[PDB]
Amino acid sequence: NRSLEDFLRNVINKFHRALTLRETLQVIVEEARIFLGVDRVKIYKFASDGSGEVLAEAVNRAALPSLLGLHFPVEDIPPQAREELGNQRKMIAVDVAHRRKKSHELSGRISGHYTTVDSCHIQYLLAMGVLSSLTVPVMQDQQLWGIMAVHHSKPRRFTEQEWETMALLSKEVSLAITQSQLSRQVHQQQVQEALVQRLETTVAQYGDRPETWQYALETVGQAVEADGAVLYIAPDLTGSVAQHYQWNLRFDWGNWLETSLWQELMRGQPSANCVPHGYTLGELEQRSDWIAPPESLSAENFQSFLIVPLAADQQWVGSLILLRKEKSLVKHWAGKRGNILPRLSFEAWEETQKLVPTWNRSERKLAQVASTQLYMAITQQ
């Protein structure tokens, strides 16, 4: 007999009333650095393409540089090393001055063997001013989420007491990542429900008037974090012209929406139940029925479209159109990357990248739930 909105709030109040993920990573590296008495302890998180970022860092600035916020390319860690770190779950200790390494299991020991290090990784570590390195794999969903990096500018051997402690801290990071990922999912459930309740109240208050649909559309566009949005309402029983509503736009899509192109698009039909389908601008232009929009239309940098038909079997009543502009992202890399020899400079290199917007799992679900509500509201609930 308790509402969902009240229930989700109780989950966070009791199970997710903690610190953020970033703040937790920061606490962990500082405790490791003090306990080890080393120059630098970092936490590095892989991206999908194998590259990564330094998310947390405790560092003696007099001894080592700060790599916080810097990105490293995929080639820095070759498949051989990733295999040993992830699938074998090996912590790796590199003794630079003697060009040797050793591996201990992240799991346990129940009881060291030295191996010669490749000359590239030796120069690499030298270029960093590092003579002692301990790489600790961070696991999540049986995958290498990233590493914990312990660096010292002087020769430094680690006792087993220190191995086990870093292995323990690795599980703490894994714990926090799990915590943060679940708290994210709960919060997405709150946003979903808050959108539904807001839409229901809007209709109950205003009814079947343009103010309802204008307010509802931009409420949805804001929840799904789009850059712009359009709600199209088809002619009802015995004809009722056509209604369209816009948010964060500049020109009237009214005439453009009546095009053969958009009538097919809004229904989710190719030829060129509220299942949202994503599109890029470059894909729509390749349609056989593609008709160019006005001049000051394509200059708004709108590149990503999420079109959701307002339908239910033999009943199509309209469509929800969510838009996203091309975004410019800045990444600071450690040295100039963009082969056989390692780079010997790790200075901050700035790069700007025009990324094509994507509609993730949560946003697509949110758009589905939103359009479903819109369908039920249009057919007079």
Ligand X SMILES: N[C@@H](CCC(=O)O)C(=O)O
Is residue 198 near ligand X by the rule CB under 6 A?
no
Q: Closer to a copy of itself at the Cβ: 1 or 380?
A: 1
Q: How far is the CB of 121 from ligand X (least distance, A)?
A: 15
Nearest to 38 by CA among 145, 117, 149: 149
What is the distance between the terminal CA atoms of the chain, rounded to a whole angstrom?
23
Nearer of residues 40 and 324 to ligand CYC, judged by Cβ: 40
Nearer to ligand CYC, 144 or 297 (CB): 144
Angle at 154 between CA 150 and CA 155, to 5 degrees: 85
Task: Confirm or reject binding of residue 319 to a copy of itself (CB under 8 A).
Answer: no
State residue 125 phi and psi, 5-degree precision: -65, -30
Interacting partner of 87 out of ligand X, ligand CYC, a copy of itself, none (Cβ under 5 to 8 A depending on kind): ligand X
Tell me how far apart the alpha carbons of residues 305 and 288 are, in angstroms, rounded to a whole number: 18
Q: Which of 74, 186, 297, 376 binds a copy of itself (CB under 8 A)?
A: 186
- For 177-186, the CB contacts below 8 A with 24+ separation are 177/21, 177/138, 177/140, 177/145, 178/140, 179/16, 179/18, 179/21, 180/20, 180/21, 180/24, 182/16, 183/12, 183/15, 183/16, 186/8, 186/11, 186/12, 186/16
Residue type (1 letter), 275: V
Please identify, using beta-carbon distances, which residue of 103 and 371 lies nearer to ligand CYC.
103
Provide, rounded to whole angstroms, the least separation between the CB of residue 354 and ligand CYC.
24
Is 120 annotated for ligand binding?
A: yes
In the complex, the residues that contact ligand X under the rule CB under 6 A are 79, 82-83, 86-87, 144
In the complex, the residues that contact a copy of itself under the rule CB under 8 A are 1-2, 4, 7, 10-11, 14-15, 24, 27, 31, 34-37, 108-111, 142, 161, 164-165, 168-169, 171-172, 175-176, 178-179, 182, 185-186, 189, 275, 361, 365, 368
